[PDB]
Ligand binder design. Structure first.
Ligand SMILES: *[C@@H]1O[C@H](CO)[C@@H](O[C@@H]2O[C@H](CO)[C@@H](O[C@@H]3O[C@H](CO[C@H]4O[C@H](CO)[C@@H](O)[C@H](O)[C@@H]4O)[C@@H](O)[C@H](O[C@H]4O[C@H](CO)[C@@H](O)[C@H](O)[C@@H]4O)[C@@H]3O)[C@H](O)[C@H]2NC(C)=O)[C@H](O)[C@H]1NC(C)=O
Ligand SMILES: *[C@@H]1O[C@H](CO)[C@@H](O[C@@H]2O[C@H](CO)[C@@H](O[C@@H]3O[C@H](CO[C@H]4O[C@H](CO)[C@@H](O)[C@H](O)[C@@H]4O)[C@@H](O)[C@H](O[C@H]4O[C@H](CO)[C@@H](O)[C@H](O)[C@@H]4O)[C@@H]3O)[C@H](O)[C@H]2NC(C)=O)[C@H](O)[C@H]1NC(C)=O
Ligand SMILES: *[C@@H]1O[C@H](CO)[C@@H](O[C@@H]2O[C@H](CO)[C@@H](O[C@@H]3O[C@H](CO[C@H]4O[C@H](CO)[C@@H](O)[C@H](O)[C@@H]4O)[C@@H](O)[C@H](O[C@H]4O[C@H](CO)[C@@H](O)[C@H](O)[C@@H]4O)[C@@H]3O)[C@H](O)[C@H]2NC(C)=O)[C@H](O)[C@H]1NC(C)=O
Ligand SMILES: *[C@@H]1O[C@H](CO)[C@@H](O[C@@H]2O[C@H](CO)[C@@H](O[C@@H]3O[C@H](CO)[C@@H](O)[C@H](O)[C@@H]3O)[C@H](O)[C@H]2NC(C)=O)[C@H](O)[C@H]1NC(C)=O
Ligand SMILES: *[C@@H]1O[C@H](CO)[C@@H](O[C@@H]2O[C@H](CO)[C@@H](O[C@@H]3O[C@H](CO)[C@@H](O)[C@H](O)[C@@H]3O)[C@H](O)[C@H]2NC(C)=O)[C@H](O)[C@H]1NC(C)=O
Ligand SMILES: *[C@@H]1O[C@H](CO)[C@@H](O[C@@H]2O[C@H](CO)[C@@H](O[C@@H]3O[C@H](CO)[C@@H](O)[C@H](O)[C@@H]3O)[C@H](O)[C@H]2NC(C)=O)[C@H](O)[C@H]1NC(C)=O
Ligand SMILES: *[C@@H]1O[C@H](CO)[C@@H](O[C@@H]2O[C@H](CO)[C@@H](O)[C@H](O)[C@H]2NC(C)=O)[C@H](O)[C@H]1NC(C)=O
Ligand SMILES: *[C@@H]1O[C@H](CO)[C@@H](O[C@@H]2O[C@H](CO)[C@@H](O)[C@H](O)[C@H]2NC(C)=O)[C@H](O)[C@H]1NC(C)=O
Ligand SMILES: *[C@@H]1O[C@H](CO)[C@@H](O[C@@H]2O[C@H](CO)[C@@H](O)[C@H](O)[C@H]2NC(C)=O)[C@H](O)[C@H]1NC(C)=O
Ligand SMILES: *[C@@H]1O[C@H](CO)[C@@H](O[C@@H]2O[C@H](CO)[C@@H](O)[C@H](O)[C@H]2NC(C)=O)[C@H](O)[C@H]1NC(C)=O
Ligand SMILES: *[C@@H]1O[C@H](CO)[C@@H](O[C@@H]2O[C@H](CO)[C@@H](O)[C@H](O)[C@H]2NC(C)=O)[C@H](O)[C@H]1NC(C)=O
Ligand SMILES: *[C@@H]1O[C@H](CO)[C@@H](O[C@@H]2O[C@H](CO)[C@@H](O)[C@H](O)[C@H]2NC(C)=O)[C@H](O)[C@H]1NC(C)=O
Ligand SMILES: *[C@@H]1O[C@H](CO)[C@@H](O[C@@H]2O[C@H](CO)[C@@H](O)[C@H](O)[C@H]2NC(C)=O)[C@H](O)[C@H]1NC(C)=O
Ligand SMILES: *[C@@H]1O[C@H](CO)[C@@H](O[C@@H]2O[C@H](CO)[C@@H](O)[C@H](O)[C@H]2NC(C)=O)[C@H](O)[C@H]1NC(C)=O
Ligand SMILES: *[C@@H]1O[C@H](CO)[C@@H](O[C@@H]2O[C@H](CO)[C@@H](O)[C@H](O)[C@H]2NC(C)=O)[C@H](O)[C@H]1NC(C)=O
Ligand SMILES: *[C@@H]1O[C@H](CO)[C@@H](O)[C@H](O)[C@H]1NC(C)=O
Ligand SMILES: *[C@@H]1O[C@H](CO)[C@@H](O)[C@H](O)[C@H]1NC(C)=O
Ligand SMILES: *[C@@H]1O[C@H](CO)[C@@H](O)[C@H](O)[C@H]1NC(C)=O
Ligand SMILES: *[C@@H]1O[C@H](CO)[C@@H](O)[C@H](O)[C@H]1NC(C)=O
Ligand SMILES: *[C@@H]1O[C@H](CO)[C@@H](O)[C@H](O)[C@H]1NC(C)=O
Ligand SMILES: *[C@@H]1O[C@H](CO)[C@@H](O)[C@H](O)[C@H]1NC(C)=O
Lengths: 161, 195, 161, 195, 161, 195
């Protein structure tokens, strides 16, 4: 229903509208909406690069509105917020993968599966890069298929088992 | 589609919308790299063969008292400086904070054959590894070590220069991103050899 | 059954008695007991202010008994323990909410739901404050109702589905 | 009740029972704030217009060698001091550790029109932001900025004075709580402008 | 299926072979294999000493292969990796237990349950020590039995409920 | 078996296989403790009644510039040194880095009746508590306080000596393990009394 990753109480996320990404969050699409069932996973997750970007965007939204005309960012507000908002361990894991020539998240593209009959979508996962380029679908096909199965299980276990 | 009914879709985030809260790293080419700091202003970071500061002096503590600089720009620069592995002064940095301008230069050029042979230290290791963390997605001037197999790198460049600049579109080789700064900011444990 | 958040092995928490808060933990009630099913959630949680207070109380209990007459606390024992015992990120999130005028946890009151027929209760959640006062039930009613639904699901999915 | 059968109930914790393991922050009013340190003793923190230390000297390192103080009280004070944003000495602190007593004074009063205009620094910013973290639930002497919209604050007070005291009931405006100390203790990453 | 705790993408862990510990990971047995269902728990866990050792071994594997002839370890690579790879809070909890005379994990032996008819096993948990010796089965019997029940539930809830 | 069908089984890890990536702590007896650093080399840490360095000098900064030492061995030693609670120099450490050798000695022997009475400080507290973290599973030379009831300890020994050595089987009292080093490395928050 509600989220734990927002700073704002209730206003940060309403239950009935799901959770939407606006035109200033996305680059090409004007609007993308995810069900709260998937977005809510960031309430618990200690992983998923997407969830840190999601928290940074919530922070930016509140920081701007609260500090009318933030003018020049103070830096100290964000430094404290960083310790509160992001998974530092996760940035370091991607840093380790960058070094040692291992595909890693560079926090740009994310991918998700979208059902073609119903509107159900998965939480986005980071699209990895290696040697300056994005990895092909065939390299991370194991995760794409696992994600599809996870979605199928959730669709099947509806109301009761 | 996957498993009949799942279409794979792509989402990409526009991190420029985060510029009022977080500094954003960018890359233009093999040398120029950038940090957006405010709505209109930021820092330019370059790798060059030409020294612009011929001083062997910085007098950073006097610059600080003079207090004619933007605290946000200064905060980012001092974040960089104090995040350097094996932090010490080693001379290394000269600067110019006359008036309200910022010009900071690191002597990467220190490297000569004996220290070059050691590789994992002698100023350049620490400065270059900090530069690479600020610059996620930037140009991997590790050259032959560009994918990072090894963690001790050397570049052809002689100086790292940081200056106060105007934000203009640059970001030709990378997406604006807060990760570089956040990485340096959160990585505060222990990373020294000498102290 | 057993807990992972205690320092003590088995003695820290027994299965059959559930988990109880004594008169020195609570201010007005002499005794409040929670089922292990709810308390055990702190075994996993990376959130919930209540779980940090719960860990600090377990630490205090053991620290006192182990160091007979702790006399003047050494400070260094607790400083190491803090890194082991609490969610620092969570304190910083509440710090961020305090600043920027957002309702936040000041670690005093907690609220929970208690079934009126059976003895089942939820894990307590922090009652938030804003502008020096506690928030009304109508401001956090979304979470109260979500908690009620979560409890209902658990009551219904008993033994088998 | 909620959904027919759920009664909303309140739990409130008595954190005074944690006094043998953790220091507990408290508030009495707009000026006086407290830390319980032991079973009988603690620290008093006040905001005043009157200086009690007319020294421009601290000689903290000599006080440390003298070693006539309670290490627990000293540990908490040095925790406070070293947690100050933009940490440096800037003169700022004068002290008196003659005998086994503790009296520490910060020159918040430094502020005058030029530095007042800068706001985000010049001793008071760092001292006041540390004070506010020790004092969770305390009096928000940010005044017009009392709910914390903005993160640079100024107070009417001239000095922050920390002294060794006797624990007596105070805690008139807040619940004893270990959070203040724990907050300062865990927040150890990077928070400077100058170094 | 896949793991989140490895650095390597797909190669770090394949789905169909389960996850195996080789003769250089184990001291006495040449080979021990765990189902991915149990090993995958380390994908999520914020606890379990076993999962940190598991991550350190994956790191060592990749670090060696990536840095051909790592020669003398650089130290700085591992220091960054440590922040990315291990649960520091967990080491500190065991440190706290060591001090104050409480049974604690010294990261040597781990125990798990193994079904005698089928091949199902649990994720290993640390065998604790106290006063220089390992604890008896009778001191941690509560956890052994709880683990058995957890395995039973998983065996029973197969395909559907 | 448990619940009819579960056999309890034991797994034990061979952490020696981690020697190419992480330093591994070991113990031989009540005095000698070890760190494997490379494939062939490591550090020996001993507790003794005999001083081997009669210098009151270290000149560590000159040793660093001289740069004839293995950076990995030096990095581990400086990790130890800077992880000491209540870190300061207090004289305390003397050293010898002539040529490429390493010999570092801590004056635990400082302790005499007044400082012995204080217990929780005066060099030995900080050095001994760092030693015990490097040495997980080592000999708990806390003596009567061997299980760690109390966190201020004293030993009979006068000096802690760290030297560059050859890796040979030692590890007679413990399993090689990266935990000691990792513990010290990750525990980087605040742990001082004086600063
Ligand atoms: C994670 O990794 C990915 C890797 O793909 C980074 O994403 C971008 O990747 C593309 C390459 O696929 C980068 O390059 C872009 O090329 C486009 C086409 O280039 C042709 O035309 C130019 C003309 O200037 C020639 O120089 C070039 O040789 C080719 O012939 C350009 O159109 C792109 O934008 C340029 O023009 C616009 C104006 O229209 C300017 O505003 C831009 O600044 C730029 O000059 C671009 O050059 C691309 O740079 C990568 N970044 C971005 C933002 O798109 C991800 O960025 C990376 N993640 C992070 C966080 O860095
Ligand atoms: C999270 O935020 C909450 C906000 O509510 C803090 O909780 C307490 O909130 C109350 C206000 O509702 C605070 O004030 C209390 O007022 C009571 C009644 O006040 C009348 O009588 C006094 C007489 O002295 C007049 O001055 C006043 O103007 C009113 O006319 C007092 O009875 C309370 O206790 C006082 O008396 C007892 C002795 O009987 C003393 O021991 C107390 O120290 C005190 O003098 C009190 O003043 C109250 O202070 C807030 N704190 C506490 C502990 O109750 C939470 O504390 C906060 N969380 C944290 C961690 O701080
Ligand atoms: C977590 O805690 C456990 C506690 O059990 C540590 O595990 C090991 O525990 C045993 C005790 O059960 C330690 O001692 C071993 O004793 C064996 C038998 O000892 C007899 O013979 C020796 C002859 O040298 C006499 O001195 C002794 O008094 C007895 O009469 C020895 O065979 C063991 O190995 C020795 O010989 C081999 C060569 O065959 C050498 O390579 C060894 O270095 C050593 O000299 C051993 O001494 C044992 O040391 C503990 N460690 C290990 C590695 O086995 C766990 O280590 C601890 N976890 C961590 C991380 O430390
Ligand atoms: C730096 O970040 C700020 C905040 O995210 C960006 O400012 C924002 O700009 C958008 C427009 O691009 C504003 O959206 C609205 O647009 C409609 C018309 O399309 C207009 O009617 C609204 O009044 C509003 O302008 C948004 O409000 C605005 N946010 C604020 C508070 O300024 C800014 O564009 C980013 N900088 C860069 C270089 O991207
Ligand atoms: C500081 O913390 C200590 C520890 O939590 C508190 O001491 C405790 O005080 C309670 C009584 O309030 C003791 O409980 C018991 O009470 C019964 C009678 O009601 C008595 O028979 C028992 O012998 C016992 O006293 C509790 O044992 C005691 N704990 C210890 C180990 O001292 C102390 O009250 C707290 N300080 C403040 C100001 O609250
Ligand atoms: C320090 O760590 C390294 C890496 O884990 C250990 O080196 C490894 O040694 C094993 C043999 O014990 C090598 O396994 C293989 O053995 C078969 C024959 O049994 C042989 O045909 C293979 O060529 C290979 O040698 C393993 O490859 C090797 N790893 C590497 C990359 O060196 C080393 O033993 C550890 N040091 C200590 C003291 O334990
Ligand atoms: C790569 O960066 C260099 C600077 O290090 C660019 O060369 C100069 O850039 C400055 C600043 O924009 C201009 O004022 C000079 O006029 C440029 N030099 C010349 C000879 O034109 C260089 O153009 C950049 N290049 C790319 C993407 O090819
Ligand atoms: C740092 O301070 C030195 C002080 O010697 C500056 O060097 C100049 O010294 C001569 C006397 O030998 C004075 O007449 C000049 O006025 C000094 N120059 C300046 C700018 O103060 C040195 O230039 C200073 N460096 C920086 C970066 O401020
Ligand atoms: C000037 O730029 C060149 C690159 O164009 C730098 O590169 C070095 O050039 C010398 C002479 O050919 C080689 O021996 C070095 O091996 C090159 N360095 C690297 C990392 O490959 C040169 O360092 C720059 N500065 C000076 C003073 O020459
Ligand atoms: C608020 O704090 C001030 C001190 O800054 C209190 O005034 C003095 O407090 C001391 C210490 O308890 C007493 O010895 C003095 O006698 C008090 N002054 C006077 C004139 O009585 C003040 O009373 C406190 N006030 C509240 C809650 O109103
Ligand atoms: C810090 O040290 C100075 C040293 O000058 C102290 O000032 C006094 O200096 C005169 C000589 O000019 C001596 O006769 C006094 O005995 C010194 N006083 C003391 C207390 O030592 C200054 O007072 C010292 N400050 C603190 C806080 O100890
Ligand atoms: C003495 O206390 C007063 C408050 O009672 C302090 O407040 C300042 O008063 C001056 C004169 O009216 C104003 O111009 C300032 O703007 C007030 N400060 C603030 C933050 O509003 C005063 O600073 C204290 N000390 C002295 C030396 O006057
Ligand atoms: C315990 O450690 C001590 C050293 O502090 C051992 O005694 C000496 O060890 C060195 C180094 O291996 C040898 O060169 C000396 O010859 C040993 N001394 C003697 C008299 O033989 C001691 O043997 C170790 N003991 C155990 C496990 O009992
Ligand atoms: C640290 O430096 C001192 C400098 O005095 C060294 O002491 C010796 O001093 C005499 C002159 O009084 C010189 O002739 C010797 O050559 C110096 N010895 C050395 C090794 O330089 C002291 O020994 C040095 N200590 C260390 C550990 O390097
Ligand atoms: C030399 O070794 C002995 C142990 O064999 C050290 O132990 C101390 O011995 C004295 C004299 O009997 C006792 O008063 C102390 O209480 C012992 N210390 C402890 C912690 O129990 C002795 O310190 C060592 N060094 C010297 C210079 O004597
Ligand atoms: C994947 O491979 C196909 C076939 O070569 C190619 O057309 C496509 O662009 C590739 N996509 C990526 C992300 O590499
Ligand atoms: C840096 O700031 C000063 C402020 O005095 C300004 O004059 C100068 O032009 C700025 N530098 C650049 C490159 O814009
Ligand atoms: C909620 O509002 C009612 C009606 O005004 C009031 O009686 C009650 O005290 C309020 N409770 C809180 C916590 O604000
Ligand atoms: C502070 O400690 C000293 C110890 O010599 C004592 O004399 C003094 O009265 C104490 N201060 C207060 C306010 O109790
Ligand atoms: C447990 O107790 C039995 C009976 O005394 C003994 O044989 C066995 O070795 C003990 N095991 C452990 C781990 O203590
Ligand atoms: C320490 O290194 C030096 C290098 O010059 C070597 O001569 C010395 O023998 C080594 N020490 C030991 C105990 O092996």
């Amino acid at each position: 229903g509600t989220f734990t990753w927002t700073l704002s109480d209730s206003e940060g996320n309403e239950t009935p509208g799901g959770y939407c990404l606006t035109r200033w969050m996305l680059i090409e699409a004007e609007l993308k909406c995810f069900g709260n069932t998937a977005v809510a996973k960031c309430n618990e997750k200690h992983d998923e690069e997407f969830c840190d970007m999601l928290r940074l965007f919530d922070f930016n939204k509140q920081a701007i509105r609260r500090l009318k005309a933030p003018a020049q960012m103070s830096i100290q507000l964000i430094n404290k917020a960083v310790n509160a908002l992001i998974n530092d361990q996760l940035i370091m894991k991607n840093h380790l993968r960058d070094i040692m020539c291992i595909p890693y998240c560079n926090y740009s593209k994310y991918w998700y599966l979208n059902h073609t009959v119903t509107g159900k979508t998965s939480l986005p996962r980071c699209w990895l890069v290696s040697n300056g380029s994005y990895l092909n679908e065939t390299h991370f096909s194991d995760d794409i298929e696992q994600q599809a199965d996870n979605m199928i299980t959730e669709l099947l276990q509806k109301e009761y088992i | 589609t996957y498993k009949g009914v799942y279409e794979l879709q792509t989402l990409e985030l526009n991190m420029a919308s985060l510029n009022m809260t977080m500094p954003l790293s960018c890359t233009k080419n093999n040398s120029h790299h950038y940090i957006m700091v405010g709505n209109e202003t930021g820092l330019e970071l370059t790798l060059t063969n030409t020294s612009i500061i011929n001083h062997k002096f910085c007098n950073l503590s006097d610059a600080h008292k003079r207090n004619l600089y933007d605290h946000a720009l200064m905060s980012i620069i001092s974040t960089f400086h104090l995040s350097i592995p094996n932090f010490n002064q080693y001379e290394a940095m000269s600067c110019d904070f006359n008036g309200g301008k910022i010009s900071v230069q690191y002597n990467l050029s220190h490297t000569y054959a004996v220290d070059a042979a050691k590789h994992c230290g002698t100023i350049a290791n620490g400065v270059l590894q900090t530069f690479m963390r600020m610059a996620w997605g930037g140009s991997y001037i590790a050259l032959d070590s560009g994918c990072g197999s090894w963690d001790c790198i050397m570049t052809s460049y002689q100086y790292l220069i940081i200056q106060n600049t105007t934000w203009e579109d640059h970001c030709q080789f990378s997406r604006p991103s807060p990760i570089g700064y956040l990485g340096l900011l959160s990585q505060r444990t222990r990373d020294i050899y000498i102290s």
